[PDB]
Design an enzyme around this catalytic site. Structure first.
Site, PDB file in Angstrom:
ATOM      1  N   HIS A 142       1.850   6.143  -9.083  1.00  0.00           N
ATOM      2  CA  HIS A 142       1.454   5.096  -8.145  1.00  0.00           C
ATOM      3  C   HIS A 142       2.048   5.369  -6.772  1.00  0.00           C
ATOM      4  CE1 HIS A 142       0.802   0.587  -7.136  1.00  0.00           C
ATOM      5  NE2 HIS A 142       1.680   0.917  -6.217  1.00  0.00           N
ATOM      6  N   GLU A 143       3.359   5.628  -6.739  1.00  0.00           N
ATOM      7  CA  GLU A 143       3.969   5.835  -5.422  1.00  0.00           C
ATOM      8  C   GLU A 143       3.474   7.126  -4.763  1.00  0.00           C
ATOM      9  OE1 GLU A 143       5.267   3.282  -4.476  1.00  0.00           O
ATOM     10  OE2 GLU A 143       6.089   2.429  -6.334  1.00  0.00           O
ATOM     11  N   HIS A 146       0.298   6.661  -2.975  1.00  0.00           N
ATOM     12  CA  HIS A 146       0.316   6.019  -1.664  1.00  0.00           C
ATOM     13  C   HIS A 146       0.319   7.094  -0.577  1.00  0.00           C
ATOM     14  CE1 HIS A 146       0.290   1.768  -2.547  1.00  0.00           C
ATOM     15  NE2 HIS A 146       1.367   1.873  -3.285  1.00  0.00           N
ATOM     16  N   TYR A 157      -2.376  -1.450   4.939  1.00  0.00           N
ATOM     17  CA  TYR A 157      -1.718  -2.188   3.852  1.00  0.00           C
ATOM     18  C   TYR A 157      -1.725  -3.694   4.086  1.00  0.00           C
ATOM     19  CZ  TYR A 157       1.317  -2.185  -0.279  1.00  0.00           C
ATOM     20  OH  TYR A 157       1.850  -2.351  -1.558  1.00  0.00           O
ATOM     21  N   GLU A 166      -3.575  -0.551  -2.973  1.00  0.00           N
ATOM     22  CA  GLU A 166      -2.819  -0.808  -4.192  1.00  0.00           C
ATOM     23  C   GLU A 166      -3.583  -0.396  -5.452  1.00  0.00           C
ATOM     24  OE1 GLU A 166       0.077  -2.001  -5.542  1.00  0.00           O
ATOM     25  OE2 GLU A 166       0.800  -1.212  -3.592  1.00  0.00           O
ATOM     26  N   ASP A 226       2.516 -11.533   0.586  1.00  0.00           N
ATOM     27  CA  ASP A 226       2.266 -10.211  -0.005  1.00  0.00           C
ATOM     28  C   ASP A 226       1.267  -9.425   0.811  1.00  0.00           C
ATOM     29  OD1 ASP A 226       2.384  -8.196  -1.960  1.00  0.00           O
ATOM     30  OD2 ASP A 226       0.702  -9.046  -3.069  1.00  0.00           O
ATOM     31  N   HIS A 231      -1.009  -6.999  -3.852  1.00  0.00           N
ATOM     32  CA  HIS A 231      -0.702  -6.685  -5.233  1.00  0.00           C
ATOM     33  C   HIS A 231      -1.346  -7.718  -6.171  1.00  0.00           C
ATOM     34  CE1 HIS A 231       2.876  -4.858  -3.177  1.00  0.00           C
ATOM     35  NE2 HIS A 231       2.718  -3.909  -4.087  1.00  0.00           N
TER      36      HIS A 231
END
Ligand SMILES: [Ca+2]
Ligand SMILES: [Ca+2]
Ligand SMILES: [Ca+2]
Ligand SMILES: [Ca+2]
EC number: 3.4.24.27
Length: 316
Positions: A142-143, A146, A157, A166, A226, A231
Site C-alpha cells: 500500500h505505501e 503511493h 490526496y 487510497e 480525513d 480512507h
C-alpha cells in the site's frame, strides 16, 4: 554504502524466518543490491528525524525483537519490487529503478505507516491498535504504491481523487499480498491490526461496510475529516475492484468476475495512462473502461464487467 552483497537471516514481526539481502562493509547493512538501484532500510530509533541511520548489524543475523520490523520492511519492499517488475514491467516506483528507502521504529507508539514523498515510514504501533506495521505485506505494498501513484497519475490526496489514491494503494497492496500468496485476503492490515482481536482488519474491500465505510456512491462521506474522507470513500472504489475480480451481486446488480490478474492489468493501465491529479470517480470509471477496452476489446467480457461493477456501486 560500498560493499559486497550478502545474504542474512532473521525473523519478522510475526515470528517467521526469512532470508534478506544485505551488504557487507565492516557491518552488515540492510541494503539489497539485487533489485534496481537498491533497497535501503533505516533505523529511526523511536524519533521522528528521517531517514535515521542505515540499518547496521554485526553478524548478519536478525533475530532480536528490535530487528523484526526492519526485516519485514526490507523483505516486503523486495516482494513489492518484484511484483511491479515481473507483473507490470515497472522498474521501482518511478519506472527507472529509483532506490527504495524505508525507516522503521518511527516515533513512539505510532499507529500508522506512510510515504512521505521520498520514502516509506513505519511506526511500531502501541501494541494495542497495532503491532509494527511493516509486518503486513499489504500495508508495505500500500505505501510503496503511493509512490507509484505520485510518479504517475499524481492523484491529489483530497476528496474523490484522494479516495482513488487510497483505493489504488489498497488494491495493489492486496494484489501484492496474493502475489506472495501466504495468507491472502481482500482485507487490509489484518496481520498487524489489534493483536488482541482475531478476525478483524483496518478496512475490507469485499465488504467495506463491515467497518462503516461506504460501499455505494449514495453513501459517500462529504465532510472535511480525513482530507474529505480519503480512507472512507475509498471503500466505494475498493468494492468496485473486488467485484470486477471476484464478481457478485451488490444492491441487486450482478457482476461477472474476471479475476485478480485482469483487475491488476486494468487498474495499472488506468493509473499510468489515463488518470490525472484531479480525476474523480466518474472519470476513474471511464479510465477503467478505456483500459479494459485497450487490453481486451470493446465487446469483451472484461469491459462489460467493469461497467457492471461501477454500476453496482452507483458510479456512472
Ligand atoms: Ca545481529
Ligand atoms: Ca492476509
Ligand atoms: Ca490483507
Ligand atoms: Ca486483529
Amino acid at each position: 554504502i560500498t560493499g559486497t552483497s550478502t545474504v542474512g537471516v532473521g525473523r519478522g514481526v510475526l515470528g517467521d524466518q526469512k532470508n534478506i539481502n544485505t551488504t557487507y562493509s565492516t557491518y552488515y547493512y540492510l541494503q539489497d543490491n539485487t533489485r534496481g538501484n537498491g533497497i535501503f532500510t533505516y533505523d529511526a530509533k523511536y524519533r521522528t528525524t528521517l531517514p535515521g541511520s542505515l540499518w547496521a548489524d554485526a553478524d548478519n543475523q536478525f533475530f532480536a525483537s528490535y530487528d523484526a520490523p526492519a526485516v519485514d520492511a526490507h523483505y516486503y519492499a523486495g516482494v513489492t519490487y518484484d511484483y511491479y517488475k515481473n507483473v507490470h514491467n515497472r522498474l521501482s516506483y518511478d519506472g527507472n529503478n529509483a532506490a527504495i528507502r524505508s525507516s522503521v521504529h518511527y516515533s513512539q507508539g505510532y499507529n500508522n505507516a506512510f510515504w512521505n514523498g521520498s520514502q516509506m515510514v513505519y511506526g511500531d504501533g502501541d501494541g494495542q491498535t497495532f503491532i509494527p506495521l511493516s509486518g503486513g505485506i499489504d500495508v508495505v505494498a500500500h505505501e510503496l504504491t503511493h509512490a507509484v501513484t505520485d510518479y504517475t497519475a499524481g492523484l491529489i490526496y483530497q476528496n474523490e481523487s484522494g479516495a482513488i489514491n487510497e483505493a489504488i494503494s489498497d488494491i495493489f497492496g492486496t494484489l501484492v499480498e496474493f502475489y506472495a500468496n501466504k495468507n491472502p485476503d481482500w482485507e487490509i492490515g489484518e496481520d498487524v491490526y489489534t493483536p488482541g482481536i482475531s478476525g478483524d482488519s483496518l478496512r475490507s474491500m469485499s465488504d467495506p461496510a463491515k467497518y462503516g465505510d461506504p460501499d455505494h456512491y449514495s453513501k459517500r462521506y462529504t465532510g472535511t475529516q480525513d482530507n474529505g474522507g480519503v480512507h472512507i470513500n475509498s471503500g466505494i472504489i475498493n468494492k468496485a475492484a473486488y467485484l470486477i475480480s471476484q464478481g457478485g451481486t451488490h444492491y441487486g446488480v450482478s457482476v461477472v468476475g474476471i479475476g485478480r490478474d485482469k483487475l491488476g492489468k486494468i487498474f495499472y493501465r488506468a493509473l499510468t495512462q489515463y488518470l490525472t491529479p484531479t480525476s474523480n470517480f466518474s472519470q476513474l470509471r471511464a479510465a477503467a473502461v478505456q483500459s479494459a477496452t485497450d487490453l481486451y476489446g470493446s465487446t469483451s467480457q472484461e469491459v462489460a464487467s467493469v461497467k457492471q461493477a461501477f454500476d453496482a456501486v452507483g458510479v456512472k
